[PDB]
């Protein structure tokens, strides 16, 4: 008994390449100087972030902290996953595995580099059908998802130290390739986070600042509101807080 808008949802999903890099930035160009951005950091996590930007917004994306070998990283490692959470609450996962969404998969197994490729796949109005406590909506909330693997630092650092100095870069323009589809795909409002910075071991602050430097120049006002919704349980809230510190001067009012 198939949810409804699943169909709809995985008929629509679409495979980026890497080859597509130049026509993402291409998209990136046609947006600029769009909006007069508006950014805020909070403490939701990505889908309550979503729901609530939902309510104002239909052109909403959120940003999926990927794996890039198995659809919702197969669940392994702790349910503390972003991911996990995303294919637990919506129909993400009927997306991730649709046989267009195949290539990412594959390519990213071939690779053998814990940097990944720059395959990104987009989840076209994934409905979110339970909040964070895992309670059924109302209404069904369908939002579209960016997929996208962070490099994995911790990997990285475990097999080729020598790929270190890439990560940042890597994760850099892989960013760069995220926004770059939700223009192409005339997205206004976008749900971003602490990509990469959990799991993946790559530094929060450096994450926000690339985030941060990409809104100042190559998608400055290409998005009309950005939400970086950093779920952090920790109560000194390291990562939280270094998203704050780093993107303070630019969600300033
Ligand atoms: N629902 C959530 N919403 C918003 N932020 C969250 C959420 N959950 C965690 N965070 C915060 O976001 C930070 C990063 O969340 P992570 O899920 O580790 O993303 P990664 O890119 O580093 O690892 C991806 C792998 O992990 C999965 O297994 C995938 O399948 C991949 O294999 C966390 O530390 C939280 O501060």
């Known amino acids: 008994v198939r949810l409804p ?46 729901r609530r930007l939902r309510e104002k917004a239909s052109a909403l994306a959120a940003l999926n902290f990927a794996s890039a070998k198995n659809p919702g990283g197969g669940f392994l490692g702790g349910a503390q996953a972003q ?15 649709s046989p267009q969404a195949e290539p990412y998969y594959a390519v990213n197994r071939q690779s053998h580099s814990a940097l990944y490729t720059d395959h990104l796949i987009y989840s076209p109005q994934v409905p979110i059908f339970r909040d ?8 069904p909330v ?13 990997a990285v650092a475990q097999s080729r130290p020598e790929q270190l100095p890439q990560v940042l870069p890597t994760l850099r323009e892989r960013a760069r390739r995220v926004l ?24 929060p602050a450096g994450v926000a600042r690339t ?29 939280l807080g270094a998203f704050r510190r780093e993107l303070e001067s630019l969600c300033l009012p």
């Open 5 to 50: 808008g699943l169909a709809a949802m995985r008929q629509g999903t679409r495979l980026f390449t890497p080859e597509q890099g130049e026509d993402l930035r291409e998209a990136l160009r046609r947006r600029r100087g769009s909006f007069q951005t508006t950014c805020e950091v909070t403490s939701e996590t990505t889908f309550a972030a979503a």
């Open 83 to 97: 991911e996990e959470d995303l294919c637990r609450g919506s129909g993400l996962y009927f997306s991730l595995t």
């Open 132 to 139: 964070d406590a895992g309670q059924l909506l109302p209404a």
């Open 142 to 154: 369908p939002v579209n998802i960016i997929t996208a693997p962070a490099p994995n630092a911790g």
């Open 180 to 203: 770059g589809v939700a223009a192409w795909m005339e997205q206004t409002h976008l749900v971003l986070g602490a990509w990469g910075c959990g799991v993946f071991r790559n530094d």
């Open 211 to 239: 985030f941060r430097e990409l809104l100042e120049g190559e998608a400055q006002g290409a998005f009309e509101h950005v939400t970086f919704a950093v779920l952090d349980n920790h109560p000194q809230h390291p990562t």
